[PDB]
Every structure is written in structure tokens, then in C-alpha cells.
Amino acid sequence: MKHSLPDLPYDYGALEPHINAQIMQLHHSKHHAAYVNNLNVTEEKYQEALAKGDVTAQIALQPALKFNGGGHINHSIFWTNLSPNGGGEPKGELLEAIKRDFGSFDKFKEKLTAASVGVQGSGWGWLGFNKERGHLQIAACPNQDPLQGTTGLIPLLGIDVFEHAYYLQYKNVRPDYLKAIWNVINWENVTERYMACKK
Amino acid sequence: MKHSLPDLPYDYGALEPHINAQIMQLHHSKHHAAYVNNLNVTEEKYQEALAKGDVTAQIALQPALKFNGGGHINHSIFWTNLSPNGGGEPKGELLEAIKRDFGSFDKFKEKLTAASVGVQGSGWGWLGFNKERGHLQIAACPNQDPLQGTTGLIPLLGIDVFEHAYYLQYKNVRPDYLKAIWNVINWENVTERYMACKK
Numbered sequence: 078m079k080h081s082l083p084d085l086p087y088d089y090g091a092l093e094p095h096i097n098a099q100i101m102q103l104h105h106s107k108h109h110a111a112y113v114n115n116l117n118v119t120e121e122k123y124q125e126a127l128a129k130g131d132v133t134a135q136i137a138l139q140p141a142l143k144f145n146g147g148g149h150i151n152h153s154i155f156w157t158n159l160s161p162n163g164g165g166e167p168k169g170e171l172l173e174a175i176k177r178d179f180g181s182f183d184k185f186k187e188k189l190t191a192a193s194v195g196v197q198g199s200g201w202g203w204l205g206f207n208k209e210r211g212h213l214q215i216a217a218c219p220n221q222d223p224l225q226g227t228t229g230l231i232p233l234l235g236i237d238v239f240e241h242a243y244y245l246q247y248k249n250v251r252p253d254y255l256k257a258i259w260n261v262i263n264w265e266n267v268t269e270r271y272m273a274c275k276k
Numbered sequence: 277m278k279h280s281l282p283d284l285p286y287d288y289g290a291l292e293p294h295i296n297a298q299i300m301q302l303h304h305s306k307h308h309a310a311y312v313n314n315l316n317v318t319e320e321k322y323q324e325a326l327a328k329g330d331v332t333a334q335i336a337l338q339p340a341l342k343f344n345g346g347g348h349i350n351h352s353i354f355w356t357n358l359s360p361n362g363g364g365e366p367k368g369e370l371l372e373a374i375k376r377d378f379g380s381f382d383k384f385k386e387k388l389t390a391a392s393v394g395v396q397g398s399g400w401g402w403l404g405f406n407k408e409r410g411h412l413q414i415a416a417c418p419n420q421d422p423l424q425g426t427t428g429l430i431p432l433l434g435i436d437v438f439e440h441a442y443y444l445q446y447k448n449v450r451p452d453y454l455k456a457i458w459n460v461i462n463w464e465n466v467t468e469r470y471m472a473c474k475k
């Protein structure tokens with residue numbers, strides 16, 4: 078098998094006015110498209126080096142694998158974390174865990190926003206689930222480094238703070254992007270990942 | 277493919293008094309043995325992950341692959357860079373290149389000493405050849421990060437500054453270890469690696 082660019086589950090303009098059609102179309106059809114292709118290229122190179130036992134080449138491929146592989150993991154999740162049917166607050170057991178672990182829904186939003194704005198350079202903000210501790214956890218990740226691969230936390234909600242995700246519309250004012258994106262969060266999807274975490 | 281621990285080109289005591297037999301035995305039969313075994317286990321997990329397209333697992337395995345993979349690369353080179361017949365100064369084209377790029381042999385030693393002593397924590401000092409620039413270059417690497425895999429430079433001479441390489445004999449006094457190791461440098465091996473770069 079090879080990786081494929083997943084279609085967006087909605088129209089490019091479905092998230093307006095919070096994220097405009099130009100960003101969505103570029104962020105999916107150009108950026109993510111490149112990560113999948115580069116990911117498949119790196120995996121093939123990594124396969125040849127492994128068959129040859131060329132460990133030097135394997136390690137030299139690690140930055141491309143983490144960046145483009147992480148890109149595929151993160152963005153594929155990101156599209157499902159957003160929806161025109163999104164916004165508002167989650168329900169049921171996820172809403173209860175958020176209040177228990179962060180005090181309230183608004184406190185959680187403040188913490189994830191602060192983590193996302195606090196990224197200096199490129200990276201991501203994540204809400205995750207800690208299997209060992211059995212509760213939610215917020216983390217920030219540099220560049221395309223994916224949450225679970227580098228921290229073991231299971232991703233529930235990611236916020237792409239790469240400049241290409243918002244600069245066209247919001248320019249340098251990243252907090253304006255963070256303010257707007259809460260209105261299109263697909264809490265239905267995020268709830269599925271949370272419920273999938275417990276057994 | 278199954279990597280294997282290469283036999284040492286000499287007995288564990290052949291580098292005394294500069295590196296004592298206990299260090300050599302532990303550094304080869306324990307530390308390096310673990311890198312090969314851990315490298316093989318990590319490589320086997322990669323084959324499964326690649327076959328499954330599990331990119332998260334590939335990225336999670338990267339720290340173990342670089343540390344143990346790099347360990348295998350570096351230590352395998354390190355042993356050949358040392359010899360009971362070593363020490364003194366190189367000759368021929370290697371010596372002529374060292375004088376040109378670093379001013380003199382003694383000046384070269386000061387620069388490689390300073391790079392090796394300057395490593396805070398675990399890492400390596402390397403003399404390398406820059407193929408693109410066509411000259412020698414000194415660099416430091418953190419942990420077991422290998423020179424070529426992370427910098428593209430071809431390794432000519434490596435100095436292990438992990439504490440397990442000198443602490444038993446020299447304790448915290450790494451500069452005494454660095455001074456002593458010059459007595460067992462296998463310049464014949466370093467010359468072969470250098471001449472191989474100008475094919």
C-alpha cells in the first residue's frame with residue numbers, strides 16, 4: 078500500500094468566514110498533497126536502505142520522514158477536526174472530562190489557545206488523551222512532529238498554527254485565527270476519538 | 277539484514293595505558309553490543325511499520341534508530357581509528373591537507389580537542405571531509421548522532437566523548453583522556469578514508 082491524499086469532507090468554502098476558500102484549497106491541495114507524495118518517496122527510500130542495511134541513509138532520511146510523515150498524519154486529522162456543522166461545545170462524556178481536567182470548557186479553550194499562540198515558529202497545538210494517566214492532556218509540537226509518534230498521546234483535536242494556515246486572511250495576527258477557528262471545530266468527530274480512547 | 281558486532285582489530289589491552297582494558301571491553305562488548313541488538317530490533321519493527329504504512333510507529337522509532345544506529349556507525353569507525361601501532365603524525369596527502377586547512381598538525385589537534393572537550397553531555401568529535409567543498413572540516417555531534425547521516429561529511433577520525441569511554445580511568449577529567457588518545461590514533465586507517473574520498 079501507499080498513502081493517498083484524503084478528500085476534504087466538505088467544500089473548500091464551507092468554513093467561511095473563519096477560514097477562507099483560498100487557504101483551504103491551498104492548505105489541502107498543495108501543502109498536504111506535497112506531504113503525501115514526499116512521504117511515499119521517503120518510505121520507498123527507507124525501504125531500500127533497510128534492505129541494504131544502510132543505516133547512515135536511514136538516519137539521513139529521518140528529518141524528511143518526520144516532517145512529511147507528520148504532515149500527513151496531522152493534516153488528515155485536522156480536516157476531520159473542522160466542519161461547517163461545527164462550533165459550540167462538546168457534549169456527553171468528553172464535556173465532562175474537559176470540565177474535570179481543566180475546570181471548565183472556557184478554561185480548556187484558554188489553555189489550548191495559549192499553547193498554540195505560544196508556539197514560536199512552526200508547529201501545532203494538540204488536545205490529547207494520556208492512556209497511562211487515563212485523562213486529557215494539552216501539548217504543543219514543533220514543525221510537523223505528530224503528537225502520538227513523538228509523545229505517545231492520542232490526538233483528539235489539533236490546531237495548525239503554521240503561517241500558511243492563516244496568514245493569507247489574518248496576516249501576522251495569529252490570535253485572530255485562533256479566535257475564529259473555535260467556531261468550526263467538529264466536536265462530533267473529536268468525541269469519536271475520545272470515546273475510541275476508552276474501553 | 278541482521279547487523280553484527282565487528283570483531284576488534286586488537287585485544288582489549290592494546291591501547292594501554294591511554295585507554296585501559298576495562299573500558300575497551302565494556303565499550304565494545306557491552307555498549308556496542310547493545311546498539312547492534314537494539315538496532316536490529318528497531319529495524320525489524322520498521323519493516324512491519326513500512327509494510328503496514330504505520331507512519332506514527334516509524335516516527336516513534338526514530339529516536340531509538342538514530343541513537344543505536346548511530347552508535348553502530350560511530351563505534352564501528354572508532355575502533356578502526358585507533359591502533360596499538362598508532363600515534364605520532366600522519367604523512368603524505370593527509371598531512372599536507374591538515375596543514376592547509378588548519379595551519380599545522382598541532383593547530384589541528386587544538387581545534388579537534390576543543391570541539392571534543394566542548395561537547396556538553398554525550399556526543400562525538402569528528403574530523404571529516406566535505407566532498408562539496410573539497411576540504412577537511414571539524415564538527416561535533418550530539419549523543420550518537422552520526423556525522424554523515426546528519427551532516428553529509430564523510431568521517432575520517434572520531435573521538436568518543438561519552439563518559440563511558442574515559443570515566444573509569446580519567447573520571448571527570450576529559451582533557452586528560454583527549455590528550456592521551458592522540459597516542460593511539462591509527463593514521464593509516466584515517467589516510468585510507470581520506471584517500472578514498474578523492475577517487
Ligand SMILES: [Mn+2]
Nearest residue numbers: 108237239242
Ligand atoms: Mn499545514
Ligand SMILES: [Mn+2]
Nearest residue numbers: 307436438441
Ligand atoms: Mn561510546
